[PDB]
Symmetry: C2
Subunit: 200 residues, 2 copies
């Protein structure tokens, strides 16, 4: 299982080894040995979520406060989504930068988003199903959103032929990256790096 | 999340609460609190597998030796499969009995199969995708198969319009339930119950 670190350190694109046969195909989405190899520790799966999205739906950008924050291991099992990770860790060398992975049912990649990072996606097709393993259960009291179209982050979302994204009400009213930063709610690089080190 | 114990004790059918909105739908597939409620302990996810199957493919019947065996939390995210669990635990009150759950992308149910049970499924539609969380990594040296069409177990598979199942080569040559039993490879109820108790 090929794992490539993204331009945001602590986020990875994983490409599975897909076994194809007369019955269809099989692959190992996660393995503890494969995960540990790139992440340096085991993924503690406390929750697994699934969404189905129509074309142009944008969910994000979410993060969870440290600790324990909420690491995400994210894949698309039908359709396709353009998935984004944002370095929101203050003091990080790449603070403010983002990168993307194309998740879909063709190459069946995954994005791993480690703790204190922000994540979201835009569904590129109808009936786009995303599953994601989380290192913590849903905790609306420590989960935050950043406007997915925030001009400081300036993520380049690939609009669908060629229309405005559909967002939830909460995601549509999300505060700006600068609002969140100035609220002292962004994770700190020093502590996220240390928290990941104590797991390793 | 509604959890109903099957006729095989230690296997459960889980029905999620599906949240539907303008974007599509979302649900929590697993939560630690929801899992613990019915299973009495946390699921230790060490591997997650995914298959895509065409109509009439039958995978099974697999089990893993205790300990730690391999508990499975199994769902269908596209298409539909008829999923079977078999009580292969010697000394169990329901030794030899089986039950089924219909997994599909409509009701989005799950089957939880605890340790020392045997599991399999028959895909009822093309492009039937199954994901499953496992409490242990793939260990071909402690994993065994029982003929899915074994006459002692006598599972009633729902053949697809109306043809023989397609099996892997290994599953097509699997030994009989009585071969496995007589090889002392079946799990023991007393130890599986005790192993689950030490986790609880």
């Amino acid at each position: 299982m090929k794992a490539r670190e993204l331009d945001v350190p602590g986020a990875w694109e994983i490409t599975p080894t897909i076994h194809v046969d007369s019955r269809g195909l099989f692959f190992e989405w996660l393995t503890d040995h494969g995960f540990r190899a790139f992440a340096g520790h085991s993924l503690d799966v406390r929750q697994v979520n699934c969404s189905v999205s129509s074309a142009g739906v944008l969910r994000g950008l979410h993060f969870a406060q440290l600790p324990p924050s909420q690491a995400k291991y994210v894949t698309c099992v039908s359709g396709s989504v353009f998935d984004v990770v944002v370095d929101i860790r203050e003091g990080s060398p790449t603070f403010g930068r983002w990168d993307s992975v194309l998740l879909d049912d063709q190459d069946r990649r995954t994005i791993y988003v480690s703790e204190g990072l922000a994540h979201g996606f835009l569904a590129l097709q109808d009936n786009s199903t995303v599953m994601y393993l989380c290192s913590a259960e849903y905790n609306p009291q420590r989960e935050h959103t950043i406007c997915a179209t925030d001009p400081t982050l300036a993520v380049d979302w690939p609009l669908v032929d060629g229309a405005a994204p559909s967002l939830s009400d909460r995601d549509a009213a999300a505060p700006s990256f600068e609002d969140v930063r100035a609220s002292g709610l962004l994770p700190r690089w020093e502590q996220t790096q240390r928290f990941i080190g104590e797991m390793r």
